[PDB]
Structure formats: structure tokens, C-alpha cells
Design a binder for these strands. Structure first.
Ligand SMILES: [Mg+2]
Lengths: 412, 295, 131
RNA sequence: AAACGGCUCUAAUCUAUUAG
DNA sequence: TAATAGATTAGAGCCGTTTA
């Protein structure tokens, strides 16, 4: 009481899987080679022993293979044995294959047309071996069969895996955040973003991590300043939220610290010999051509060429302190014509970025980002941000590591 | 620019399920960039293409493609710029186990230019609409109201929600933010982090990977490296794990598409769709409230 | 070195109560929940638009293959998946022969005139927008 | 506008401060 | 009113179709 489906396996896998799963759904014991995970002895034994019908797929590739042809031949031998005219039912699917060029052993057989409306063909199949007396539907059997073979090859496995993030932690912070009462030594029209070291104008003060005499070369009114006026706050209390006074609120001073971090990163990369591109909300920092050995760091290429343009891996970094003091970076691709001059129009930049990211993937992005970050490190495992003469901001070379108990097998 | 939005808006009064199909979609091969391949290359996705269209054609024709697998209404509200307009999308399960997903419409207008929040009266009106819809579809009040949005709920509007919600009903407000710069890579394989992993930063805030590598799909739902969505339980009491489970469940109901899952929860996406549809044209009294007239 | 919590994939139900993770595969094996009997397609567009819609509808009737058939399942065909007829020979066609407002209004009043006046029922109107 | 994504661009608001 | 930030938010458009 088995329905046998014979087919060209790689070509007709999809049709065979669909039809077999449906037929198991309606409640018909179906035997197929792709339904089972020598074998030929079993194939012949089931063709000869208890199969009721023998459905043969008749695609353009289903009549030119020795295997399908000779399982069809043995099926015909069985058909003559049973003294039953209703044994072999062709299932023609291919539009390019006409009712000519069909195999001689099956040409006389009344096929079931699947060329149009596969559902109509399956309906013909069902109303055919309904009154042909071929032996309660249970579609859960079809679902289980789908899960057992077509699904178990790729599913959720309890496998430990390790992930590299884009969050590069801040190793250490300057001990004291200092506000300087620069009442007249700082002109009110001066841009403190132009200062060689990060500084913010909060409450008429100069919110900065630097000492009181760093801003000297460009701001020569500031010497002879009494250091007692400046207010210094322990950065640990700021980060932990302990320091929340009427002078400054905790969120505000954390925001000032973050702005100092961002400005420090910006001016450090200004001194790190990396070119800048004005993003929508930030700055993208990338490498020109010819600035890396074979245009690569270690063994990871950061700058390359595609369709007459030069693509450059670039990074845009900001600082946040909610989960931990950490710099989050964003990976971008910046396109140039000759590698030295930036492309003026942004539509071509966006189109080329999409085209390049079409073929870039997890491993490529991760290795390029890690290569960039480690290329910004003067230390073996740290990046320096110059916020003060005696104070620096340390960014870990290795980003936050993560791990997972459940993962997937990687086919490549 | 606004052809589809205006057309869908002007069909709302006389309820007519309409699907706009571009010629460049149905027969993409004919239209060519005049120097090479067609302007839209659908060859790799033809079946998928057909899939989506068929599902859409099966949805707007009054067919239900797939359900979800109680007592909790998930309501995503999204604000559209015009004055700002808040539009909701509600989904829940009734006694018949046939998930009800229609979406609450009749956008509530905040006069403020950039206050992506609801005045107390508008918040009470929206929550009353949603709660009464639950009561009418289930003959009893819901056990929980799961509000999620792309914006954080203020104290005033959440307090209004609390006054207007009935007793023995817990309501939770979640800020679901996309494009959070946390690109979590994979160091051993060449393929991205698989879909479903979550980074619990805190008992109330976390990162969820509603998109990424799928084992069953044997590839990634997102190109390049997936961008996780930040799920923050801004208001109310709820387990972060149950919240992330609910968000992953919501990422399955995108009847507008035939895709394994989408990056953001479906309720927010459909609230955004109906919000664009409403704000396209003039005000419509008692809008149809069913997605097939907007999506 | 942080714990990453795993959230099990939620199952979306399909016909006959069977649940599958992939909507497409669940549709192919089981099919949708409610059995609408068919789609009385309505088309609002030009002659070439109607021809394009009819040709693509007939293409939908037959199976259509993705390039990579494991990462995105095949399409068994509309009747194969959904169990309802959406043939292109039962189509209700409305011929089309500030600027956004007028262009919207043309397809609009065609649709209301057909929904109000025409005897034939249309379950969903497929506005084939020209390009 | 089949759709989902990645990206790019722009704008606004809320906070804290400084100059009108 | 203007400015400098961070944090949130919203709008568009635009390319590719998810490494077998
Ligand atoms: Mg759609």
C-alpha cells in the first residue's frame, strides 16, 4: 500500500518533496528516495513487495538518466506481474518537454498533467487513486516528516559560540572632572571646540578633564589662575551616579563626560592621520590609499578597489556610559575616485556603499572593524585619547566579548 | 511621492480592499535601464516575489494566511508628523484562538511640534478605544495591556493611561528602538549572529536580535550584519524575557509580506502604515480599522 | 563575556492546526486558515497594464522558482498553496487612457464607479500603476 | 507602490549651558 | 531669538534580494 515516486533527484527535488509531503498529509503511505535519509536492494524490494501505485515524474530531466529509466523498467516488470493495468502513472511537469520525446516505456501511459496548476494535477492524482481503490488523514505526520529530514539538517543546536561586539570598553577615566571659572580669561565669543583639548562651557565654567594650564598656547589670558576656583569631582561618583547635586545633575555631568569623550576621539583621530567625511550626524574616519602595507593591516584589507572607484573602511565613534563606560563605533564604506579625493555627490556614495556591502558579510565586517581599532592603538591593547597632559582616556583594543549557549552549524 | 498613500486614504470611506501593483514589479523584465539589466532585478526572488504578492492578494481578498501561537493585548502606537498624530495597532487572542489583528485608528492629535507623546485626554481616549475593542471581541477585559512604541512614554501620559485603565489589569509600556549602534559580530564563523539571541543589559532594558542568521532559512534575514532592536521596558512591571518572547512573536504577523520575519515587531510596522495612510489625506470619521484597507 | 539569552522561535499556525516557523513552508505544506473560495480580481489600468497583470497572474498559477531554493522556498502555485482560484480570465478591468491629486482621483472614481454601478463583484482591486 | 532589510541624507523636539 | 552639545524622534529616498 505504498505510493512510489521516481524522479530526477537534484532537478525535481522541490516538486517531489511538495507532492510527497502533501500525499502523506492526505494519509497515503509514500515512498521516495529524498523522503529517506544497499539502498538499491531496498528500492527494488519496495517496488516489488507492497507498493500499490508507481508514480513517475516526467520532467525534461526525468527521462534521460539511467537510474530513473531502469527503476521505471523494473516498475514496469512489476506492473506486468500484478496483472493490473493501473500501476504506473506519469506526472508531467515540464513545459519544454512535450508529449513527444517522452520515454517509450511510458509513452502509452495516461499521464497526469502538472504543467499548469500543480493543485489541479494533485487533484487529478487524488481523484484518480480514490476510485482506483488505493488505501484517515493526519497532517501532523507530514509536519513531522518535514521536521525530520528537510529541517533537522539546519536547526537550533545547543552549541556555545563567541561574538565580538562593536562596543569597545573604556579601560580607565581621568580621576577628576574639572570645571574652571574662566570669567574673563576665556572670551565669550571663543569656540571651545577649537581648543586643542576637549572642553565644554557649562555654568560659565570650562568643563574639561584637562589641567588648568593646558589651554595656554591658544588662550594666553588663562595663566596666573588660582586653582582653588576650579571644582574637581571624582569621576567614579559621576559614573556610579553618586554625585547628584544642585550644582550639576548626574545625567548632565554624564552627558558632559560623553561630549568630552566624543570631542577627544575626534581630535585624537585628527592627530591619527585618518581622513574625515561629514556623515549625516557624525564624522566617518577612514584611511586613504597607499597608507597601509599592501593596503592592509596584519592580513585584513581596509582599502580596496571596485568599479574604477576606491572603497575605504571607515568608522564613526561615540561614547556612552549606561551599561558601562564604552565607545560604540559604526562601520561605513567611503568611496573615492582616485583614492585621494572624496566623491562630492552623496547619491553615488550611497549607491556604491550598497554595491560594496552586497558582497560583505559578518566575518569581513568584523575583521575590518577589529583591524581598524587595533590600527588606532599605540598601545598593544589600548587606544589613547588626549583629554589632559597627565590624564588620558583608555579604550580597550578588544571590544566587549559575548557568548551564547545556542547557535547554528556554519556551512561554508 | 504620495500616490499610494492618497489613493489608499480616499478609498477608506467606501471600504474597498485595494492593492497597488507597479508595472515595474509584475513584469520587471520588459523595463530595462537602457544599457543593461532591468532596473529592478527580481530574478533571484521571483518565487518569493510571487509569494508576497499572492499572500497580499490572499489577505486583501479576506483570507487569513497564518495565525500566532493569551489574555494579553499587544498595542503598538506610532506618531506621524503632519501637529503630530498617534495611531495604534492592536493584536490579541480571543476564545476561538483566532488571533485578532486589526489596529486602532482615528489618530489622536498632539498639537505640539515635537512632543511625540499623548496629552492625557488623547491617551485616555486611545486606551478606552483599545480596551473596549478587547471587551467587544472577547466579552471580558484583558489580563494585560502590552503597549510598545518607538518613543518613551512620559510620566503624564502614562499616568493618564493608569487612571483610564480598569482594575486587575496590568499595563506595560515598551520603547522599541531600532538602529542602535551595537554591531555584534561572529568571530569563529563567516556568518552573522543567529536570529533570536538577546543581550540583557538590565532587568528592564535589553538588545534583541529579531533578525539575523536563521538555521532553518540557512541564511540571514538581513544583509551585511544585523542591527538589533533595543527593547526597553519603560513603564510597568514585566519580565524582560517574556517581553522579548512577545516581541519575537510579533515579528511573525507581517501579512503585508511573505517573509520569514521582519526586523521590527509587526504592530509598530502596521501602525506606521495606517498612520501614513491617514495623514495622507483629510480627516476621516471612524476609519475602517482593518489592515487590508491600509496595507 | 556576557550571557546571551536565547528566545525560542515562535510557531505560526496554519491549516489543520499544524504550526511551522517559516510562513512560506507552512503555507506550502498546510495552507492558510480560512478557505475563501476565490479572488474576483479587479484591475484598474491601461491595456498594457491589464495584459501585464493577466500574464503575471497566469505565471503565478504555475510554480515559479527562486534562484536559491533553500534560503527561500519555491512557490507551488496559487491554487497549490492557498486552495482558492485566482485565475486571470475572471478579471474585472477598468481602462485608463494637484497632479498627484488628479492621478489618484482618476483611479479612485474608476474604482467607486465600478464598485457602485457594476454588477460583477470584485474582492480586491489591483491598481496596476503605470511606469 | 510585492516585500524585508541594510545604508545615506535631512529635519524637528526635550534637556543643561552660554551668548540675545 | 541665536549657539554648543547629548539623547531621542521622525521623515524620506536608495540599493540588493540575504555568502549555497
Ligand atoms: Mg503591500
Amino acid at each position: 500500500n505504498k505510493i512510489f515516486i521516481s524522479h530526477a533527484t537534484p532537478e525535481d527535488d522541490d516538486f517531489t518533496r511538495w507532492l510527497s509531503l502533501k500525499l502523506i498529509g492526505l494519509g497515503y503511505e509514500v515512498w521516495c528516495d529524498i523522503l529517506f535519509l544497499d539502498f538499491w536492494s531496498t528500492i527494488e524490494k519496495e517496488i516489488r513487495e507492497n507498493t500499490c501505485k508507481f508514480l513517475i515524474v516526467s520532467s525534461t530531466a526525468g527521462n534521460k538518466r539511467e537510474g530513473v529509466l531502469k527503476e521505471l523498467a523494473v516498475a514496469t516488470k512489476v506492473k506486468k506481474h500484478l496483472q493490473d493495468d493501473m500501476f504506473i502513472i506519469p506526472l508531467a511537469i515540464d513545459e519544454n518537454l512535450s508529449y513527444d520525446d517522452i520515454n517509450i516505456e511510458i509513452v502509452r501511459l495516461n499521464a497526469i498533467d502538472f504543467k499548469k496548476s500543480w493543485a489541479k494535477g494533485l487533484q487529478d492524482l487524488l481523484d484518480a487513486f480514490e476510485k482506483q481503490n488505493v488505501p484517515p488523514p493526519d497532517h501532523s505526520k507530514s509536519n513531522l516528516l518535514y521536521q525530520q529530514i528537510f529541517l533537522h539538517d539546519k536547526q537550533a543546536i545547543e552549541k556555545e559560540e563567541t561574538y565580538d561586539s562593536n562596543w569597545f570598553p573604556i579601560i580607565s577615566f581621568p580621576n577628576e572632572l574639572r570645571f574652571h571659572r574662566y570669567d574673563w580669561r576665556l572670551p565669550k565669543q571663543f569656540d571651545v571646540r577649537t581648543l586643542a583639548f576637549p572642553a565644554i562651557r557649562y555654568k560659565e565654567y570650562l568643563c574639561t578633564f584637562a589641567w588648568e594650564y593646558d589651554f595656554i598656547h591658544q588662550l594666553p589670558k588663562t595663566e596666573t589662575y588660582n586653582g582653588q576656583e576650579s571644582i574637581r569631582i571624582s569621576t567614579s561618583d559621576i559614573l556610579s551616579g553618586r554625585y547628584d547635586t544642585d550644582f550639576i545633575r548626574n545625567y548632565e555631568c554624564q552627558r558632559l563626560i560623553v561630549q568630552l569623550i566624543n570631542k577627544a576621539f575626534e581630535l585624537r583621530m585628527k592627530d591619527k592621520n585618518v581622513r574625515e567625511y561629514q556623515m549625516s550626524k557624525t564624522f566617518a574616519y577612514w584611511i586613504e590609499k597607499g597608507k597601509l602595507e599592501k593596503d592592509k593591516f596584519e592580513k585584513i584589507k581596509l582599502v580596496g578597489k571596485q568599479k574604477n572607484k576606491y572603497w575605504h573602511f571607515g568608522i564613526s565613534a561615540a561614547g556612552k556610559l549606561y551599561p558601562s563606560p564604552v565607545l560604540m563605533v559604526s562601520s561605513h564604506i567611503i568611496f573615492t575616485m582616485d583614492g585621494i579625493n572624496l566623491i562630492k555627490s552623496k547619491s553615488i556614495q550611497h549607491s556604491s556603499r550598497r554595491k560594496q556591502g552586497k558582497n560583505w558579510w559578518n566575518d569581513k565586517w568584523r575583521e575590518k572593524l577589529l583591524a581598524f581599532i587595533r590600527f588606532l592603538s599605540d598601545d598593544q591593547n589600548a587606544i589613547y585619547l588626549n583629554v589632559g597632559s597627565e590624564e588620558k582616556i583608555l579604550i580597550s583594543n578588544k571590544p566587549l566579548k559575548f557568548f551564547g549557549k545556542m547557535s547554528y552549524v556554519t556551512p561554508s | 511621492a504620495q500616490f499610494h498613500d492618497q489613493l489608499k486614504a480616499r478609498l477608506l470611506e467606501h471600504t474597498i480592499p485595494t492593492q497597488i501593483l507597479r508595472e515595474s514589479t509584475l513584469a520587471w523584465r520588459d523595463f530595462k535601464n537602457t544599457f543593461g539589466a532591468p532596473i529592478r532585478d527580481f530574478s533571484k526572488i521571483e518565487g518569493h516575489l510571487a509569494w508576497t504578492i499572492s499572500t497580499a492578494a490572499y489577505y486583501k481578498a479576506g483570507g487569513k494566511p497564518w495565525k500566532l501561537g493569551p489574555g494579553v493585548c499587544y498595542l503598538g502606537l506610532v506618531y506621524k508628523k503632519i501637529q503630530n498624530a498617534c495611531c495604534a495597532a492592536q493584536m490579541f487572542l480571543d476564545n476561538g484562538d483566532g488571533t485578532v489583528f486589526k489596529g486602532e485608528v482615528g489618530p489622536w492629535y498632539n498639537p505640539e511640534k515635537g512632543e511625540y507623546h499623548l496629552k492625557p485626554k488623547e491617551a485616555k481616549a486611545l486606551l478606552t478605544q483599545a480596551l473596549e475593542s478587547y471587551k467587544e471581541q472577547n466579552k471580558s477585559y484583558p489580563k494585560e495591556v502590552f503597549i510598545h512604541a518607538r518613543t518613551r512614554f512620559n510620566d503624564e501620559e502614562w499616568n493618564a493611561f493608569n487612571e483610564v485603565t480598569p482594575k486587575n489589569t496590568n499595563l506595560v509600556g515598551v520603547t522599541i528602538t531600532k538602529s542602535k549602534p551595537l554591531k555584534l559580530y561572529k568571530t569563529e564563523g563567516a556568518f552573522p549572529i543567529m536570529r533570536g539571541n538577546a543581550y540583557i543589559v538590565d532587568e528592564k532594558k535589553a538588545f534583541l536580535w529579531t533578525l539575523g542568521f536563521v538555521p532553518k532559512l540557512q541564511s540571514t534575514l538581513s544583509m551585511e550584519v544585523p542591527n538589533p532592536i533595543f527593547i526597553e521596558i519603560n513603564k510597568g512591571e514585566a519580565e524582560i524575557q517574556q517581553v522579548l518572547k512577545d516581541i519575537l512573536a510579533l515579528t511573525k504577523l507581517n501579512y503585508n509580506a511573505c517573509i520569514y520575519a521582519d526586523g521590527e515587531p509587526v504592530t509598530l510596522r502596521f501602525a506606521n502604515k495606517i498612520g501614513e495612510i491617514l495623514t495622507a489625506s483629510t480627516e476621516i470619521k471612524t476609519p475602517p480599522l482593518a489592515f487590508k484597507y491600509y496595507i | 563575556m556576557k550571557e546571551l539569552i536565547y528566545i525560542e522561535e515562535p510557531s505560526i499556525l496554519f491549516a489543520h492546526g499544524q504550526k511551522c516557523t517559516d510562513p512560506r513552508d507552512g503555507l506550502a505544506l498546510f495552507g492558510p486558515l480560512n478557505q475563501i473560495y476565490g479572488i474576483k480580481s479587479g484591475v484598474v489600468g491601461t491595456q498594457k497594464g491589464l495584459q501585464i497583470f493577466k500574464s503575471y497572474l497566469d505565471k503565478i498559477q504555475k510554480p515559479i522558482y527562486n534562484h536559491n531554493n533553500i534560503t527561500r522556498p519555491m512557490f507551488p502555485g496559487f491554487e497549490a498553496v492557498f486552495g482558492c482560484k485566482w485565475e486571470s480570465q475572471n478579471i474585472v478591468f477598468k481602462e485608463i487612457t494637484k497632479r498627484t491629486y488628479d492621478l489618484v482621483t482618476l483611479f479612485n472614481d474608476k474604482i467607486i464607479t465600478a464598485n457602485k454601478n457594476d454588477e460583477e463583484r470584485v474582492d480586491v482591486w489591483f491598481v496596476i500603476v503605470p511606469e
